[PDB]
């Protein structure tokens, strides 16, 4: 919905079941354990 | 295109070495386009058959 703020303590990467990808290792910051 | 050019300009190709170079270049262009169509990678030892 447009014009509505995000809920507090919500990860937009989460809350959808989304999963990223890595086309290569040269792009993106180093993954931290 | 090739038969039109060669039949129209026969006896005139032999003295136009630039035309021979252009002809072989365009033929290589056609072959490269077909090879790219087959696979998205240039063959190393592609056969003429």
């Amino acid at each position: 919905f447009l014009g509505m703020p995000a809920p507090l303590g919500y990860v937009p990467g989460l809350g959808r079941g989304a999963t990223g990808f890595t086309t290569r290792s040269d792009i993106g910051p180093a993954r931290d354990a | 295109a090739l038969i039109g050019l060669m039949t129209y300009f026969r006896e005139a190709v032999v003295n136009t070495q630039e035309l021979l170079d252009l002809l072989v270049k365009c033929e290589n262009k056609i072959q490269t386009r077909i090879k790219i169509g087959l696979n998205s990678k240039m063959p190393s030892r592609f056969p003429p058959v």
Binding site: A6, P12 | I36
Partner: protein, 141 residues
């Protein structure tokens, strides 16, 4: 660009992806001031109304919404993402990066074909769709 709707935070992007049940969501990740992003914006706006039936267009500024940059590799000047029923759809464009359209396409017919092929493939339950036109070569001659 400015004509298309804009999403300001990642939660709005999540809501936009979730709220579409029968249309493919096409999101342009980039900066409105980027010339390549400008080409994507103008093409999308040109075909924002033609494909309204089976698609929807949203614009997200990754500077104000960096929440996906790590996960979606949102570092190219302009990227295009396709989603169907909260599921990112891959396109075998032929460039080796099936996840997104990271380059600017001049022809709006090509983008309409891409959107339609994505809709057809994802409606059938598939997650990766083969692009109608190969893009491993720009065909410049």
């Amino acid at each position: 660009s400015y004509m298309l709707p804009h999403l300001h935070n990642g939660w709005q992007v999540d809501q936009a992806i979730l709220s579409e049940e029968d249309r493919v969501v096409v999101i342009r990740f980039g900066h409105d001031w980027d010339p390549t992003c400008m080409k994507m914006d103008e093409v999308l706006y040109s075909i924002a109304e033609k494909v309204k039936n089976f698609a929807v267009i949203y614009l997200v500024d990754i500077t104000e919404v960096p929440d996906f940059n790590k996960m979606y590799e949102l570092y190219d000047p302009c990227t295009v993402m396709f989603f169907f029923r909260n599921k990112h759809i891959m396109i075998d464009l032929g460039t080796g990066n099936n996840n997104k359209i990271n380059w600017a396409m001049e022809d709006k017919q090509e983008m309409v074909d891409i959107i339609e092929t994505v809709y057809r493939g994802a409606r059938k339950g598939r997650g990766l769709v083969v692009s109608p036109k190969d893009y491993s070569t720009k065909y410049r001659y």
